[PDB]
Design a binder for this molecule. Structure first.
Ligand SMILES: Nc1nc2c(ncn2[C@@H]2O[C@H](COP(=O)(O)OP(=O)(O)O)[C@@H](O)[C@H]2O)c(=O)[nH]1
Ligand SMILES: [Mg+2]
Length: 168
């Protein structure tokens, strides 16, 4: 039984809490909208193997978190979330990745660039410049919507595979 530590990073309001809940939710609770950072557990199967995912939904750069740096020491991979309708959230990705590289003293850190809210037709961040940013960091790019559940499982499963590929 292999565990995986995942950290969800991004500006405030990009949907990090909403993406993490849609993966985790067993739908016992109708709707649950967290406000405080927290960690959550989910069993998944990737390429034959069972996998326990610890998912930490961090607060944005706006909010203070005492454990912020420790979360990144613990994190094995990272979901970098912006919203495709907030251009500053896209520009903030450079800071969060730079912050990960500082705490982890490394560039080859398993990450996945994630452009949330793919349901809003007010698309300001083109898919092509998002893929370009992902190309420059050497990491996959996945489009998701925590509102329509699309891509949600694909993002997290991609991150776990990055961890696997990095491990060798
Ligand atoms: N249309 C749309 N709205 C979303 C989506 N994800 C989150 N939201 C809304 O964005 C607001 C803030 O999302 P939240 O999960 O708290 O983001 P966080 O600040 O990173 O934790 C909430 O009102 C959500 O309903 C999405 O995928 N599509
Ligand atoms: Mg939140």
């Amino acid at each position: 039984m292999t565990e995986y530590k995942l950290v969800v990073v991004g500006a405030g309001g990009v949907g990090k809490s909403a993406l993490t809940i849609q993966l985790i939710q067993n739908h016992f609770v109708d709707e649950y909208e967290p406000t405080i950072e927290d960690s959550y557990r989910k069993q998944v199967v990737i390429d034959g193997e069972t996998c326990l995912l610890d998912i930490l939904d961090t607060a944005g750069q706006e909010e203070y978190s005492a454990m912020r740096d420790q979360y990144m020491r613990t994190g094995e991979g990272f979901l970098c979330v912006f919203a495709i309708n907030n251009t500053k959230s896209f520009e903030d990705i450079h800071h969060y990745r730079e912050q990960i590289k500082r705490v982890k003293d490394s560039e080859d850190v398993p990450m996945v660039l994630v452009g949330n809210k793919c349901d809003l037709p007010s698309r300001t961040v083109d898919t092509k410049q998002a893929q370009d940013l992902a190309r420059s960091y050497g990491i996959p790019f996945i489009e998701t919507s925590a509102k329509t559940r699309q891509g949600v499982d694909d993002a997290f499963y991609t991150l776990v595979r990055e961890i696997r590929k990095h491990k060798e």
